[PDB]
Design an enzyme around this catalytic site. Structure first.
Site, PDB file in Angstrom:
ATOM      1  N   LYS A  13       0.801  -1.216   0.000  1.00 23.06           N
ATOM      2  CA  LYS A  13       0.000   0.000   0.000  1.00 23.06           C
ATOM      3  C   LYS A  13       0.839   1.272   0.000  1.00 23.06           C
ATOM      4  CE  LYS A  13      -3.842  -2.257  -0.001  1.00 23.06           C
ATOM      5  NZ  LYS A  13      -4.583  -2.402  -1.286  1.00 23.06           N
ATOM      6  N   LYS A  73       1.212   5.382  -4.883  1.00 23.22           N
ATOM      7  CA  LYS A  73       1.869   4.114  -5.194  1.00 23.22           C
ATOM      8  C   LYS A  73       2.623   4.202  -6.514  1.00 23.22           C
ATOM      9  CE  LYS A  73      -1.944   1.810  -2.896  1.00 23.22           C
ATOM     10  NZ  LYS A  73      -3.378   1.550  -3.197  1.00 23.22           N
ATOM     11  N   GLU A 164      -6.290  -1.927 -10.539  1.00 24.14           N
ATOM     12  CA  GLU A 164      -7.353  -1.630 -11.491  1.00 24.14           C
ATOM     13  C   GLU A 164      -7.924  -0.232 -11.311  1.00 24.14           C
ATOM     14  OE1 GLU A 164     -10.265  -4.670 -11.038  1.00 24.14           O
ATOM     15  OE2 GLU A 164      -9.377  -6.007 -12.541  1.00 24.14           O
TER      16      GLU A 164
HETATM   17  C1  LIG Z   1      -6.530  -7.029 -10.847  1.00 20.85           C
HETATM   18  C2  LIG Z   1      -6.370  -6.473  -9.457  1.00 20.85           C
HETATM   19  C3  LIG Z   1      -6.625  -5.126  -9.220  1.00 20.85           C
HETATM   20  C4  LIG Z   1      -6.441  -4.568  -7.953  1.00 20.85           C
HETATM   21  N1  LIG Z   1      -6.611  -3.232  -7.791  1.00 20.85           N
HETATM   22  C5  LIG Z   1      -6.227  -2.694  -6.661  1.00 20.85           C
HETATM   23  C6  LIG Z   1      -6.193  -1.271  -6.573  1.00 20.85           C
HETATM   24  O1  LIG Z   1      -6.623  -0.571  -7.491  1.00 20.85           O
HETATM   25  N2  LIG Z   1      -5.712  -0.657  -5.491  1.00 20.85           N
HETATM   26  C7  LIG Z   1      -5.267  -1.506  -4.459  1.00 20.85           C
HETATM   27  O2  LIG Z   1      -4.793  -0.941  -3.464  1.00 20.85           O
HETATM   28  N3  LIG Z   1      -5.298  -2.873  -4.481  1.00 20.85           N
HETATM   29  C8  LIG Z   1      -5.767  -3.438  -5.572  1.00 20.85           C
HETATM   30  N4  LIG Z   1      -5.741  -4.801  -5.692  1.00 20.85           N
HETATM   31  C9  LIG Z   1      -5.205  -5.612  -4.588  1.00 20.85           C
HETATM   32  C10 LIG Z   1      -6.226  -6.537  -3.929  1.00 20.85           C
HETATM   33  O3  LIG Z   1      -7.006  -5.825  -2.968  1.00 20.85           O
HETATM   34  C11 LIG Z   1      -5.498  -7.697  -3.248  1.00 20.85           C
HETATM   35  O4  LIG Z   1      -4.818  -8.447  -4.249  1.00 20.85           O
HETATM   36  C12 LIG Z   1      -6.386  -8.663  -2.461  1.00 20.85           C
HETATM   37  O5  LIG Z   1      -6.983  -7.986  -1.353  1.00 20.85           O
HETATM   38  C13 LIG Z   1      -5.616  -9.869  -1.964  1.00 20.85           C
HETATM   39  O6  LIG Z   1      -4.535  -9.440  -1.107  1.00 20.85           O
HETATM   40  P1  LIG Z   1      -2.985  -9.682  -1.437  1.00 20.85           P
HETATM   41  O7  LIG Z   1      -2.660  -9.110  -2.804  1.00 20.85           O
HETATM   42  O8  LIG Z   1      -2.214  -9.016  -0.318  1.00 20.85           O
HETATM   43  O9  LIG Z   1      -2.742 -11.178  -1.365  1.00 20.85           O
HETATM   44  C14 LIG Z   1      -6.011  -5.392  -6.903  1.00 20.85           C
HETATM   45  C15 LIG Z   1      -5.781  -6.744  -7.133  1.00 20.85           C
HETATM   46  C16 LIG Z   1      -5.941  -7.291  -8.401  1.00 20.85           C
HETATM   47  C17 LIG Z   1      -5.603  -8.741  -8.631  1.00 20.85           C
HETATM   48  O1  LIG Z   2     -11.277  -0.840  -9.851  1.00 19.74           O
HETATM   49  C1  LIG Z   2     -11.046  -0.151  -8.767  1.00 19.74           C
HETATM   50  O2  LIG Z   2     -11.302   1.041  -8.655  1.00 19.74           O
HETATM   51  C2  LIG Z   2     -10.449  -0.930  -7.649  1.00 19.74           C
HETATM   52  C3  LIG Z   2     -10.157  -0.314  -6.436  1.00 19.74           C
HETATM   53  C4  LIG Z   2      -9.620  -1.036  -5.386  1.00 19.74           C
HETATM   54  C5  LIG Z   2      -9.375  -2.380  -5.566  1.00 19.74           C
HETATM   55  N1  LIG Z   2      -8.815  -3.154  -4.454  1.00 19.74           N
HETATM   56  O3  LIG Z   2      -8.589  -2.574  -3.402  1.00 19.74           O
HETATM   57  O4  LIG Z   2      -8.591  -4.342  -4.632  1.00 19.74           O
HETATM   58  C6  LIG Z   2      -9.643  -3.021  -6.756  1.00 19.74           C
HETATM   59  C7  LIG Z   2     -10.183  -2.289  -7.797  1.00 19.74           C
END
Ligand SMILES: Cc1cc2nc3c(=O)[nH]c(=O)nc-3n(C[C@H](O)[C@H](O)[C@H](O)COP(=O)(O)O)c2cc1C
Ligand SMILES: O=C(O)c1ccc([N+](=O)[O-])cc1
Ligand SMILES: Cc1cc2nc3c(=O)[nH]c(=O)nc-3n(C[C@H](O)[C@H](O)[C@H](O)COP(=O)(O)O)c2cc1C
Ligand SMILES: O=C(O)c1ccc([N+](=O)[O-])cc1
Lengths: 216, 216
Positions: A13, A73, A164
């Site tokens: 994060k 980030k 995403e």
């Molecule tokens: C395709 C995808 C998009 C994600 N988008 C975000 C995001 O925009 N911002 C974010 O902080 N985390 C994002 N995440 C992280 C997810 O919240 C996280 O992968 C999930 O909670 C599982 O935790 P871990 O990655 O610590 O194992 C995304 C994860 C994936 C796979």
């Molecule tokens: O598409 C989004 O805006 C998005 C935001 C946060 C997360 N996430 O925290 O896993 C995923 C997608």
């Protein structure tokens, strides 16, 4: 042990802007992007790897406003990878894939290349003529690459987070992707987490095997 | 080295039917499926893991006829994984995910839990309501899981191959997936290759970095 990696990698994060990837690690992450598998080896993708301050700032424009929680980030990571998919699958692209396979020595005759071209055609035209979902089919290959990438950088001891939450229309215009035939899908900052990464000390959470797995 | 793994793993074309995974390996591949990341930790997936001969025969029904070239791979491998995506993101699944996150200790107050639930619902509604593409959004998370899986099992020294060449309608019907809220996307046999795996001794082929990567 790769299971130890899977249980210890996490979505970062907050990144430490002073901790840069080594030149060697920078080359390794590009090898990871390149050698992901894909359906029919179509490789329907392109990657923007931003490592200069200006380059990362240009990517971070896509996180302005509503997605601002992802902007720092992108600014603070050492390298930021933009995963892009082709918008349309053309024959020219498929020809270059099979010609590269020949250059790498996968064919023993000008016959077997004609059969590999015959095969990849019947597969792709199923998504271009009939289903007309080749856009989604190619995007799925890019997400497969992302999943390969996230485990690979974890195994390298690097921190990352898939994103995403960004404006793909803004990011596409900033790098002129539409006219190039590509569209941005996922942004992945890569580097080392800072002390402000609250997610580094939280337990991982997944649904139990009794829910997600059926054995037979 | 994970890069050596990436350069060594290949799509197996034929499996040795006498070589089974160990009990420890069988548990590890389920852990890999379970701990893949996903957007908002939505985990919109289910997995069929067929290891008995009758179970693998049931999956192999999806390869009869048009996709006969993939049928032996499903019959011969030690374990066959069917990656399934949810057909719609319902509110009960979102509640299930956040309840599991609370049980795993990711929130320190009940208000923290409700805030996380509110955020996941907002981002899910972006796909359910505005874009009307939650089905494709969830399928993309499953493809990300496949990419994680293929590199992980390669790091375990196991052979595998991802398969899109199957009849998902036949496979969904054989396991009643549609009524359960799922649809099959990718089949991955896992095991050890046989002498008939001609792909094991061919060089890997990918487009050059000059084509697929833009640095900035
Ligand atoms: C395709 C995808 C998009 C994600 N988008 C975000 C995001 O925009 N911002 C974010 O902080 N985390 C994002 N995440 C992280 C997810 O919240 C996280 O992968 C999930 O909670 C599982 O935790 P871990 O990655 O610590 O194992 C995304 C994860 C994936 C796979
Ligand atoms: O598409 C989004 O805006 C998005 C935001 C946060 C997360 N996430 O925290 O896993 C995923 C997608
Ligand atoms: C989603 C997906 C579906 C695939 N489907 C098939 C298939 O149905 N049958 C097959 O033999 N190979 C299939 N492949 C294997 C690809 O041809 C292979 O990954 C690609 O040529 C790159 O080679 P590699 O996996 O050896 O690195 C598939 C690969 C992916 C990622
Ligand atoms: O039928 C298919 O969808 C199919 C996809 C990929 C491959 N292949 O990568 O060899 C073959 C068939």
């Amino acid at each position: 042990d790769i299971i130890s990696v899977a249980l210890k990698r996490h979505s970062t994060k907050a990144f430490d802007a002073s901790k840069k990837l080594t030149a060697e690690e920078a080359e390794k992450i590009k090898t990871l992007l390149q050698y992901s598998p894909s359906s029919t080896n179509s490789q329907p993708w392109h990657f923007i790897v931003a490592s200069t301050e200006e380059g990362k700032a240009r990517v971070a424009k896509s996180a302005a406003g509503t997605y601002v929680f992802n902007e720092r980030k992108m600014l603070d990571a050492s390298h930021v990878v933009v995963f892009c998919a082709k918008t349309a699958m053309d024959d020219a692209w498929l020809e270059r894939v099979v010609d590269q396979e020949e250059a790498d020595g996968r064919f023993n005759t000008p016959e077997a290349k004609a059969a590999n071209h015959k095969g990849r055609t019947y597969f792709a035209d199923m998504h271009r003529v009939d289903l007309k979902d080749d856009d989604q089919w190619m995007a799925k290959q890019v997400y497969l690459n992302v999943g390969n990438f996230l485990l690979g950088v974890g195994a390298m001891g690097l921190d990352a987070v898939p994103i995403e939450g960004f404006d793909a229309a803004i990011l596409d215009e900033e790098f002129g992707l539409k006219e190039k035939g590509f569209t941005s899908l996922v942004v992945v900052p890569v580097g080392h987490h800072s002390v402000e990464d609250f997610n580094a000390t939280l337990p991982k959470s997944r649904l139990p095997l009794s829910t997600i797995v059926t054995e037979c």
